[PDB]
Amino acid sequence: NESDGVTHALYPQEARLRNLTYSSGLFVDVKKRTYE
């Protein structure tokens, strides 16, 4: 997640230098189905 110009591959050399956080994201697979 960037300041402006937005979302970008991060290598570890830059995260060190930029005070970044060598992270990846998680996506699940969600379902609505009806029950009360």
Place this chain on the structure above:
Amino acid sequence: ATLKYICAECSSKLSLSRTDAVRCKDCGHRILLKARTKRLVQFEAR
């Protein structure tokens, strides 16, 4: 004619400041190196 800054990555004298950004010209990279004085520096070789 001049130097001021340098691109950590794409190797290339940039030169800019405030309302200007903090990125680049022909690599889009957010890291910059300040660049050496011309005041000349001398060393005793000891």
